[PDB]
Design an enzyme around this catalytic site. Structure first.
Site, PDB file in Angstrom:
ATOM      1  N   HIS A   5      42.225 -16.234 -23.173  1.00 15.47           N
ATOM      2  CA  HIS A   5      41.524 -14.983 -22.917  1.00 15.47           C
ATOM      3  C   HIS A   5      42.040 -14.300 -21.633  1.00 15.47           C
ATOM      4  CE1 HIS A   5      38.585 -18.113 -21.826  1.00 15.47           C
ATOM      5  NE2 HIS A   5      38.314 -17.378 -20.766  1.00 15.47           N
ATOM      6  N   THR A  58      31.426 -12.498 -17.155  1.00 22.44           N
ATOM      7  CA  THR A  58      31.719 -11.456 -18.131  1.00 22.44           C
ATOM      8  C   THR A  58      32.410 -11.979 -19.362  1.00 22.44           C
ATOM      9  OG1 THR A  58      33.870 -10.940 -17.230  1.00 22.44           O
ATOM     10  CG2 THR A  58      31.951  -9.727 -16.250  1.00 22.44           C
ATOM     11  N   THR A  59      32.563 -13.302 -19.487  1.00 25.66           N
ATOM     12  CA  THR A  59      32.964 -13.933 -20.753  1.00 25.66           C
ATOM     13  C   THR A  59      31.898 -14.937 -21.118  1.00 25.66           C
ATOM     14  OG1 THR A  59      34.269 -15.561 -19.489  1.00 25.66           O
ATOM     15  CG2 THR A  59      35.413 -13.732 -20.336  1.00 25.66           C
ATOM     16  N   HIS A 102      39.363 -10.883 -10.373  1.00 23.95           N
ATOM     17  CA  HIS A 102      38.163 -11.638 -10.097  1.00 23.95           C
ATOM     18  C   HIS A 102      38.498 -12.922  -9.388  1.00 23.95           C
ATOM     19  CE1 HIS A 102      35.921  -9.451 -13.570  1.00 23.95           C
ATOM     20  NE2 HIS A 102      35.966  -8.762 -12.450  1.00 23.95           N
ATOM     21  N   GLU A 134      36.696  -3.972 -15.813  1.00 31.33           N
ATOM     22  CA  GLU A 134      35.350  -4.340 -16.322  1.00 31.33           C
ATOM     23  C   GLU A 134      34.303  -3.434 -15.653  1.00 31.33           C
ATOM     24  OE1 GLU A 134      35.145  -8.717 -16.475  1.00 31.33           O
ATOM     25  OE2 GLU A 134      35.592  -8.262 -18.598  1.00 31.33           O
ATOM     26  N   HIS A 151      41.481 -14.711 -11.761  1.00 32.91           N
ATOM     27  CA  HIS A 151      42.072 -14.168 -12.959  1.00 32.91           C
ATOM     28  C   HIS A 151      41.952 -12.671 -12.944  1.00 32.91           C
ATOM     29  CE1 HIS A 151      37.836 -14.661 -13.766  1.00 32.91           C
ATOM     30  NE2 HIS A 151      38.022 -13.551 -14.479  1.00 32.91           N
ATOM     31  N   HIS A 166      41.468  -9.010 -15.607  1.00 32.84           N
ATOM     32  CA  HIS A 166      41.270  -8.309 -16.843  1.00 32.84           C
ATOM     33  C   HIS A 166      42.075  -7.047 -16.861  1.00 32.84           C
ATOM     34  CE1 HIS A 166      37.532 -10.786 -17.446  1.00 32.84           C
ATOM     35  NE2 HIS A 166      37.586 -10.774 -16.116  1.00 32.84           N
TER      36      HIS A 166
HETATM   37  O1  LIG Z   1      34.979 -13.080 -13.524  1.00 32.26           O
HETATM   38  C1  LIG Z   1      34.310 -13.934 -14.164  1.00 32.26           C
HETATM   39  C2  LIG Z   1      33.531 -14.828 -13.443  1.00 32.26           C
HETATM   40  C3  LIG Z   1      32.692 -15.868 -13.828  1.00 32.26           C
HETATM   41  C4  LIG Z   1      32.429 -16.274 -15.103  1.00 32.26           C
HETATM   42  C5  LIG Z   1      32.952 -15.722 -16.274  1.00 32.26           C
HETATM   43  C6  LIG Z   1      33.835 -14.666 -16.485  1.00 32.26           C
HETATM   44  C7  LIG Z   1      34.464 -13.844 -15.566  1.00 32.26           C
HETATM   45  O2  LIG Z   1      35.289 -12.871 -15.942  1.00 32.26           O
HETATM   46 ZN   LIG Z   2      36.640 -12.055 -14.887  1.00 31.32          ZN
END
Ligand SMILES: O=c1cccccc1O
Ligand SMILES: [Zn+2]
Length: 257
Positions: free
Chosen positions: A61, A195-196, A116, A103, A91, A93
């Site tokens: 992902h 956000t996942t 993030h 996001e 990571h 997005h």
């Molecule tokens: O940035 C995040 C942080 C914590 C958990 C899940 C997914 C995310 O994209």
């Molecule tokens: Zn994230």
């Protein structure tokens, strides 16, 4: 299983993860005019001088740059936070086009990408216990715009050829995430969620106002990654962003006037 396509995308998540329609989901649109200055916030303290990166992983992902979090080495504190949060991974997005990918949005503006930096509250001992708590995580979100290159990103872009497909990893030591930060640490903050999936409501979001600039070539290389595993039909890793969710009963606070 969940993903970002037509049949398994954000609009479907709620069937396996009902918390998708919960009270403090992320991301959100940041309405800058309605975010109040909070003079009780502290400056953010980002202490990454001893950060130890270990590995980069395509998890199907996104790609995660993982850190050794077995000691207090790369920590976030201050700002809205009580206590110390330890960096575990970062990571991004991103979009299929420069006009989308973030996001969070700012007055409905979508940036090309969003970084993030994920941190867990050290009072809970490790990540897995922290995500059972409403104050378990602190995520530093940083917007990316396309313009000049970010020199500090290039070591990440150059390793992506080696983790093209889901499940691949590569050694990724000595990467300094200070080279991904903008000049200013002015931020918005609110309570929200991962956000996942599993979309857990653990996160103190800290979203920096200042984007970083990356080059069109740098983001083009993100877009060559694959969601699929090796030997499966190629599906480019693009548009791995969840749209803005309802604010509900929350206030976004600004660290700046
Ligand atoms: O940035 C995040 C942080 C914590 C958990 C899940 C997914 C995310 O994209
Ligand atoms: Zn994230």
């Amino acid at each position: 299983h969940w993903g970002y396509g037509k049949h398994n995308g954000p609009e479907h998540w709620h069937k396996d993860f009902p918390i998708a329609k919960g009270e403090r989901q992320s991301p959100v649109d940041i309405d800058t005019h309605t975010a109040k200055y909070d003079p009780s916030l502290k400056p953010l303290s980002v202490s990454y001088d001893q950060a130890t990166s270990l590995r980069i992983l395509n998890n199907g992902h996104a790609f995660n740059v993982e850190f050794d979090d077995s000691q207090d080495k790369a920590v976030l504190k201050g700002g809205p936070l009580d206590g110390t949060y330890r960096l575990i991974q970062f990571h991004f997005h991103w979009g299929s086009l420069d006009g989308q990918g973030s996001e969070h949005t700012v007055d409905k503006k979508k940036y090309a990408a969003e970084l993030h930096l994920v941190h867990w509250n050290t009072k809970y001992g490790d990540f897995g216990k922290a995500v059972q708590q409403p104050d378990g995580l602190a995520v530093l979100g940083i917007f990316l715009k396309v313009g000049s290159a970010k020199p500090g990103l290039q070591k990440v872009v150059d390793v992506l050829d080696s983790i093209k497909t889901k499940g691949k990893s590569a050694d990724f030591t000595n990467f300094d995430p200070r080279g991904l930060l903008p000049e200013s640490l002015d931020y918005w903050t609110y309570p929200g969620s991962g956000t996942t999936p599993p979309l857990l409501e653990c996160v103190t979001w800290i979203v920096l106002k200042e984007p970083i600039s990356v080059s069109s070539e740098q983001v083009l290389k993100f877009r060559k990654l694959n969601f699929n595993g090796e030997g499966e039909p190629e599906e480019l890793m693009v548009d791995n962003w969840r749209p803005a969710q309802p604010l509900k009963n929350r206030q976004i606070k600004a660290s700046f006037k």
